[PDB]
Amino acid sequence: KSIEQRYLELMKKRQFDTFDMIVESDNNSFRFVVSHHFEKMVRLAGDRYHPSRVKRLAQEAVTLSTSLPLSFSSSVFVRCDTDRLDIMKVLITGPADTPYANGCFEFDVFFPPDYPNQPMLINLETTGRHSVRFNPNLYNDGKVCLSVLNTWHGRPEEKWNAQTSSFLQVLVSIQSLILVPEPYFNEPGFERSRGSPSGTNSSREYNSNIYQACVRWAMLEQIRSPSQCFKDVIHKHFWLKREEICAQIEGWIEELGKPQYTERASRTISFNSMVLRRHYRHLREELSKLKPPR
Amino acid sequence: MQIFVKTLTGKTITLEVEPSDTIENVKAKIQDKEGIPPDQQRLIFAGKQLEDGRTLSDYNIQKESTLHLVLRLRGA
Amino acid sequence: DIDESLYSRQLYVLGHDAMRRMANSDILLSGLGGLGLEIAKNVILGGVKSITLHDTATCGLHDLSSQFYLTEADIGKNRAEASCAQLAELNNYVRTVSHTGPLTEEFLRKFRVVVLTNSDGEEQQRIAKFAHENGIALIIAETRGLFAKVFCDFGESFTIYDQDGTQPISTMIASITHDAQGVVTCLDETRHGFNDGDYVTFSEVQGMQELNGCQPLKITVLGPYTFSIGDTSKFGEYKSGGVATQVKMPKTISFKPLAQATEEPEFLISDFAKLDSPATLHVAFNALSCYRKAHNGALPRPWNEEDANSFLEVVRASSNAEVDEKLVLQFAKICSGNTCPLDAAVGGIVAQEVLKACSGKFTPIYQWLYFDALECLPTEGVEEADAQPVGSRYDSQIAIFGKKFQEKLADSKWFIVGAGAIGCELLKNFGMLGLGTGNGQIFVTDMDLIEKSNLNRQFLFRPHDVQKPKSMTAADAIKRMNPEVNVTAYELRVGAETEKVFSEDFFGKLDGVANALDNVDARIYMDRKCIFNRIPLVETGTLGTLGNVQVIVPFATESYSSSQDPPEKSIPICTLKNFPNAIEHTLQWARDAFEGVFKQSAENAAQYIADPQFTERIAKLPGIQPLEILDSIKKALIDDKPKSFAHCVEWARLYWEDQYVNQIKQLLFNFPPDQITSSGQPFWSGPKRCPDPLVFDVNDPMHLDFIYAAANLRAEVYGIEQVRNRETIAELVQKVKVPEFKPRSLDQDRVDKIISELLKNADKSSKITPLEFEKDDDSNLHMDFIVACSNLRAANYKIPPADRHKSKLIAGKIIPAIATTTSVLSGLAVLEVIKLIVGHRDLVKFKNGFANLALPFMAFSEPLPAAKNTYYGKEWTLWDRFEVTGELSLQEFLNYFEENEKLKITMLSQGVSMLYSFFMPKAKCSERLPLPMSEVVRRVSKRRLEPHERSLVFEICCNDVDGEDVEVPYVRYTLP
Numbered sequence A: 001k002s003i004e005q006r007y008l009e010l011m012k013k014r015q016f017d018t019f020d021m022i023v024e025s026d027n028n029s030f031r032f033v034v035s036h037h038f039e040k041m042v043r044l045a046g047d048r049y050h051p052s053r054v055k056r057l058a059q060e061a062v063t064l065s066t067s068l069p070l071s072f073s074s075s076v077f078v079r080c081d082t083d084r085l086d087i088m089k090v091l092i093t094g095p096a097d098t099p100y101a102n103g104c105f106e107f108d109v110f111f112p113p114d115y116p117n118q119p120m121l122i123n124l125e126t127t128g129r130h131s132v133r134f135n136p137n138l139y140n141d142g143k144v145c146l147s148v149l150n151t152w153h154g155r156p157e158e159k160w161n162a163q164t165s166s167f168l169q170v171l172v173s174i175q176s177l178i179l180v181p182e183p184y185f186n187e188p189g190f191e192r193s194r195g196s197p198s199g200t201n202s203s204r205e206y207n208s209n210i211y212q213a214c215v216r217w218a219m220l221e222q223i224r225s226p227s228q229c230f231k232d233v234i235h236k237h238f239w240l241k242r243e244e245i246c247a248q249i250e251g252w253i254e255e256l257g258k259p260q261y262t263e264r265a266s267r268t269i270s271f272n273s274m275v276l277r278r279h280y281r282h283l284r285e286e287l288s289k290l291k292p293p294r
Numbered sequence B: 001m002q003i004f005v006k007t008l009t010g011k012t013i014t015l016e017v018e019p020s021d022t023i024e025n026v027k028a029k030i031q032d033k034e035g036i037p038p039d040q041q042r043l044i045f046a047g048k049q050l051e052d053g054r055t056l057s058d059y060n061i062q063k064e065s066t067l068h069l070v071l072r073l074r075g076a
Numbered sequence C: 001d002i003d004e005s006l007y008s009r010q011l012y013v014l015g016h017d018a019m020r021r022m023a024n025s026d027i028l029l030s031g032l033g034g035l036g037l038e039i040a041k042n043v044i045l046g047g048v049k050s051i052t053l054h055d056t057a058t059c060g061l062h063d064l065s066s067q068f069y070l071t072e073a074d075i076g077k078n079r080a081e082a083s084c085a086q087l088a089e090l091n092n093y094v095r096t097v098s099h100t101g102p103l104t105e106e107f108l109r110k111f112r113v114v115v116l117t118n119s120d121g122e123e124q125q126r127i128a129k130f131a132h133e134n135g136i137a138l139i140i141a142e143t144r145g146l147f148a149k150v151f152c153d154f155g156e157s158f159t160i161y162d163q164d165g166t167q168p169i170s171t172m173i174a175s176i177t178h179d180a181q182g183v184v185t186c187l188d189e190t191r192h193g194f195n196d197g198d199y200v201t202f203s204e205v206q207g208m209q210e211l212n213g214c215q216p217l218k219i220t221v222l223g224p225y226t227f228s229i230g231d232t233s234k235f236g237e238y239k240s241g242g243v244a245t246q247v248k249m250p251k252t253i254s255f256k257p258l259a260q261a262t263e264e265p266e267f268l269i270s271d272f273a274k275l276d277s278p279a280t281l282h283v284a285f286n287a288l289s290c291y292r293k294a295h296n297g298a299l300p301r302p303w304n305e306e307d308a309n310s311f312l313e314v315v316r317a318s319s320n321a322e323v324d325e326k327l328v329l330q331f332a333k334i335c336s337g338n339t340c341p342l343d344a345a346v347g348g349i350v351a352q353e354v355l356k357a358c359s360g361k362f363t364p365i366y367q368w369l370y371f372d373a374l375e376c377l378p379t380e381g382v383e384e385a386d387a388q389p390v391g392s393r394y395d396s397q398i399a400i401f402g403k404k405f406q407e408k409l410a411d412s413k414w415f416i417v418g419a420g421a422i423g424c425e426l427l428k429n430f431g432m433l434g435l436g437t438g439n440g441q442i443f444v445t446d447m448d449l450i451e452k453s454n455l456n457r458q459f460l461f462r463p464h465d466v467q468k469p470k471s472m473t474a475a476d477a478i479k480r481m482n483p484e485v486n487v488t489a490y491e492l493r494v495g496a497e498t499e500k501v502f503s504e505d506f507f508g509k510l511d512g513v514a515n516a517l518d519n520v521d522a523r524i525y526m527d528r529k530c531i532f533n534r535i536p537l538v539e540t541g542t543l544g545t546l547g548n549v550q551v552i553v554p555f556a557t558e559s560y561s562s563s564q565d566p567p568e569k570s571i572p573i574c575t576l577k578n579f580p581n582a583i584e585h586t587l588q589w590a591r592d593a594f595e596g597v598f599k600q601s602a603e604n605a606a607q608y609i610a611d612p613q614f615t616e617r618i619a620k621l622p623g624i625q626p627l628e629i630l631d632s633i634k635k636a637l638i639d640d641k642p643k644s645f646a647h648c649v650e651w652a653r654l655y656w657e658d659q660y661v662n663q664i665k666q667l668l669f670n671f672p673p674d675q676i677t678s679s680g681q682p683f684w685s686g687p688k689r690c691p692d693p694l695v696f697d698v699n700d701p702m703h704l705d706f707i708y709a710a711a712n713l714r715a716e717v718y719g720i721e722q723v724r725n726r727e728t729i730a731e732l733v734q735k736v737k738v739p740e741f742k743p744r745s746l747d748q749d750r751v752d753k754i755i756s757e758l759l760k761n762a763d764k765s766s767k768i769t770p771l772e773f774e775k776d777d778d779s780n781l782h783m784d785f786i787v788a789c790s791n792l793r794a795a796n797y798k799i800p801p802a803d804r805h806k807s808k809l810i811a812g813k814i815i816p817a818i819a820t821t822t823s824v825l826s827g828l829a830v831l832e833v834i835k836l837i838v839g840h841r842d843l844v845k846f847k848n849g850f851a852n853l854a855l856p857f858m859a860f861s862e863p864l865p866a867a868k869n870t871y872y873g874k875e876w877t878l879w880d881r882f883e884v885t886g887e888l889s890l891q892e893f894l895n896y897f898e899e900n901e902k903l904k905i906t907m908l909s910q911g912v913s914m915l916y917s918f919f920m921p922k923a924k925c926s927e928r929l930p931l932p933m934s935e936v937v938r939r940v941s942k943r944r945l946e947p948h949e950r951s952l953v954f955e956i957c958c959n960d961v962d963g964e965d966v967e968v969p970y971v972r973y974t975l976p
């Protein structure tokens, strides 16, 4: 079988599953054994829930057990608490031909008690301890900016709709509109500057920054210290695609080595290329240590 | 036919409907003109609350009839 | 000025101009029965300059049915004199006096508004003519059994300054056409919301600068996104920008005198299903006086057929118009009675009309309002012998409902959740009704304590009752009004944590629940409890002049959760972060800054100081959490710890610079001010305002205010003594050196190092204390800091600043409230409670109520029946459930359904937990199958089962024999 066929056959079984995120503690309390961003909100909510939330979450789980996107380019993996559907973690691999390609990005999802009336809360965890802004819509504090997650006035076809909107729609929206090939033009106003040499240089600078950011945090830290929920998935994904990842990073380094027209962008590109080589050496060191999965 | 919808805050809305439209259609026209989703709208007429799946003929809503768009409040 | 600390909630409804006008108005109230007492109470709580209570009747046993300020010892005394002493304690800013002399012409000239109750026809006509001739607002109110009448005559020329009570709406302008019918188009297709025929004004318009600050212009709404303002060809070409703001145009109307208005009445409709009722009620109320004149001043006897026939004959003789004879007979049969909730509602309406007359705000009743509550009566009526008086304080109520209904009331048990304004009014109405005075009981619960701002609309509390529990104080207060009332009070918040007291046994002996809460979570919880225990629930909610009542009947109507309310409006992350365009965004940003700076930055440090073993506890946390806590503790305790107030001032100055200069400079570096997109529109256009960094000036009051508040709060956090001297802080802040800023384009080892640093350098003698945001205290400087921060951020983006009043309204999430609305909606709720206690089950009798006292508007609807669904041909609603008894294993539980109900359970849940599912791990599924359901619930929910829990509720998602999903009722699992 081709490597793509093996990847598709192996990652299909682990798309949706449950993990022990919460365990019993003393004096009728519970503690988190995994790092969840919305633990404080979970504790504040307590046992409050709207009656429709149970049915909505059951339907969402039924949809997610079979309809999660999966391809050799990008895939989505969802883990939920074994006893609570409203606490979830999402792993999205970067699509091909983008600065995020083959990078594992982890999100924390909490469904509020008012769901599906209020939109769910999603926060990006792969931020490099808030030192990296991966996208104009992905602030370094973890907040995700999407129109579908807004109940504010907006426009009826763009707001969060209690009938039409769903978790799968939000995941696909992130996967296809945030991890775009040219994230620089995601900012409004900058979109119409594309096609000009200055816009091209700015996009190249942004992509050069994102290259090293992704290589360090989305790949190296995920291999070194994977999340307990996605350990097996991350190991399999990085073992099956080590050669492709190495070739892609070498291509990135070669692209960054091309001459630049402006010195201001040239200095930043050279610095980012140096950092990218420094991180790629470590990544090559780590990839060789990956024992093959059974 | 033309009907009027009064909001609990006193704003008046004019709709162009037909005696056979359904309540879903009326709510959709209201959604165009105001912006509330149809499931958040409470229409009162002649002591009756309009429910989805019925037409204006059952409620005997005729020309120049006035509907009331009410809502619930969370104070106390 | 107006004492905001007392009138805080009422100011957001009325306004400063209205409150100033009411503070100069003298009120005369004639008649001190139940209705008059309610009117006086609401008016006094409103805060008029003075009120004079006039009455000629003496207190009797029949007055105790609704007068809560009269006792049996007051029988024989003048009602006004007896109630004046107790009424004066409601508000010390209002001068309350009592008058017993005749209502001479010279005496009437001293009052702005005159309210007439229980006055006869001749006196009514004379006083109305005199008041209309001499420019005195007149209101006439009456209550006869279950009927009401309100008349308003505010003079020949009455000016209304705010017709509807809604805030003006402003919209951003995208383009204005330059022609004879210029059309204004809104921004990026956002609905303006302007009504047709509105008046608007323009500001911040570039190119068409002539429209800036112009007089209001009548508009024509051409669509949901565009409107026309007339000819715009005389002005310059429109460039960009512009904000159109709605302007409230005053209206002047003329009121007919009483004599003319009687012949040509204009009716305000109270129920749109009774359009013919007001015409008949007008004649009935008019002919009541003739009947009294013809029968020695005696009203028709309760439920007497002969007197009803005589009254019908009198009505026929007095008028030639056709009337509802059945309605006339029903009116005659119960016109001699009197009940409390109707009096409360009519008093709340009449008091709002008095406030309208005083202040000129909101639209008055034009001109007659007639209300009835005939659905509270039994369908078969009341026998005459049952309605005879028995020498009790409920005689006027027995004259309406009979003695058997009084016995039913005495044995009723009802639960009131929340003891706020609505809760206090419900308690008063239940006490005066006689509910629970026999073998029944009245339960009231509330977790809050009494604050000063609560005294404005909660009449059961006194200034010396501050810091006492609400529920206990309210119960003690209503015990004095009616000694026979049995009340049990709790200081508990209803929820999952208090089910030990509010167990299934507690709800098992209840007859109903009345909701008086201020949040949706408690409403949802109480709705779920009422569904599970199958008891009726009455839900009430208010917002300013708006109110609503919903009645939920088991097996009859839909529940509270069956419908959805609009979600709470949030703010987009980018709008709050980088591009604010309204004062709400800046206020939310200031609130978040306050929280993050004065609370979140010190919680970990305080916990570390208090708990010696905090480090070892946080060393076991997963992920990067130990580092994220240890570095915050280090930053709070070593790096940013101020050793003196001078360091606090320096930190405040640096924080000001970072927030209003450095970050704005960085944002402008990222996006240049003159950036223009390819198609032509600049980046800093439309909803985005180009900011400009501020320049610090110690002479500027705003900058010094921010420095003062921030430094004092920072000193309070670390325990340093505050320096509340503006001159000293101004002197100190001028010596601070601001560093230059330029825009820009092993974990275990770190944990051990930080722990060692905390053990060595950090001192446990510190007194770090996070601050809790309190808005109602003016000496804690929280609101001062919020106002300064929000106004400075607004000055950054050229957003118009907001004063302390609006900032407190928005940032504090204050819900405006007034007493008149509360009284109306509690009266309506108690009427629904009476209907429930009677035994009505048809949805025709029950009425969901909606009101807006500003319009004035009232409307009703039948509650919607519960939705019906079918599985295997069996109909079920939200009230039906499965009954599974005994103790069963999980496998036995699944097999029970699979064998009896022919349903395959694919997902079994208990609340937020998940006991079983199709995608659960095989090992856990095998483990949980042989265990009893109680043990499975204990394991999954991670908490013990309390002994008071006698049953559990399960929600199941099932598949039929054909493999398709079907909706099924929930399961009630009875523990052995």
Ligand SMILES: *P(=O)(O)OC[C@H]1O[C@@H](n2cnc3c(N)ncnc32)[C@H](O)[C@@H]1O
Binding pocket: B075, B076, C417, C418, C419, C420, C421, C422, C445, C446, C447, C448, C470, C492, C493, C494, C495, C516, C517, C518, C519, C522
């Ligand atoms: P308004 O805010 O004047 O009246 C509301 C009162 O209800 C009390 N309250 C709110 N939420 C609860 C719960 N869950 N349980 C008991 N009491 C509640 C508030 O404290 C106000 O007194």
